[PDB]
Structure formats: C-alpha cells, structure tokens
Amino acid sequence: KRNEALRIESALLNKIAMLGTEKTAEAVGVDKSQISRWKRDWIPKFSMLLAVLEWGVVDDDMARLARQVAAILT
DNA sequence: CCTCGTTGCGTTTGTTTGCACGAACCATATGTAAGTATTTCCTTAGATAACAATTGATTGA
C-alpha cells in the first residue's frame, strides 16, 4: 500500500498541475492558496487512504498506449 | 560598414507564502460538597581531634 499511496499521490499532483492550481481552485470553490497547501499537507494522506481504499486508477502513459493500440488494431 | 545572435528589460500568465480571522475543540482555573470526624512522628547509629563559648563551681577581696 506504500507504493500504491506514492503512485496515487503522484497521479493526483500531476492532475492538479495539468489543470492548474488557479484553475483547480476556481473549479473546486476555494482559493489558489488552498490548493497549493492541500498539495503539501493532505494530498499524501488522502493518497494513502486511496491506496488502502483501493481506488487507484490507470497511469496516463499506459492509458495513451492502450488508446494507440486500440486505434492501430481497429 | 549592414546583419544576425546574445543580453537587458518589461509583460503576461501562473504558483507559493505571510498575515489575519473565524470556528471549534480541548485545556485550565475555580467553585462546591452539611452522621461525625479535633495535638505528629520516626529514626539512627562502633571517629577523632582541636578549638572556642557558654555555664557552673571556687576562690580573692
């Protein structure tokens, strides 16, 4: 669960970074500072919970690989 | 000499930090007990020598 927690934290932080701390705050309903500080404080803890809760999702690179394979075959 | 690559500067977009501000949850401080109830213990071992101070008896006047 340790490495799953690390993976989930990395995926979450990547999603926030891609969407944008400012944009993520605007969509969530908080201030950019709140997202910036959740990234430091709770995202690791929530990530460990997800690792235990077994909510891990497919890594996006392998997702792109699967999409490409499904396009090439079909 | 003109022209093109490198740097100084400002601009735009985006992110983390420093204060101040509720909110809530626990930590502290304080108060209130209405059968009667009434003067404490406990500890500790086999030194020895020297020196003053203090207190008590003896004696010169």
From Swiss-Prot:
Keyword Metal-binding annotated: no
Keyword DNA-binding: yes
Keywords from the named record: Activator, DNA-binding, Early protein, Transcription, Transcription regulation, Viral latency, Viral latency initiation and maintenance
Record family assignment: Belongs to the lambda phage cII protein family.
GO molecular-function terms, A-Z: DNA binding
Assembly, per entry: Homotetramer. Interacts with cIII; this interaction is essential to stabilize cII that would otherwise be quickly degraded by host protease FtsH.
Regions recorded as binding DNA: 21-40
Biological processes per GO annotation: regulation of DNA-templated transcription; viral latency
Protein task: Acts as a transcriptional activator that allows virus to initiate a latent state. Following infection, participates, together with cIII, in activation of the Pe and Pi promoters, which are responsible for the transcription of the cI (repressor) and int (integrase) genes, respectively. Both of these gene products are required for the establishment of latency.
UniProt source species: Escherichia phage lambda (Bacteriophage lambda)
Protein name: Transcriptional activator II
Miscellaneous: Lambda-imm434 is a hybrid of bacteriophages 434 and lambda. The cII protein coding region is in the lambda portion of the imm434 genome.
Domain of life: Viruses
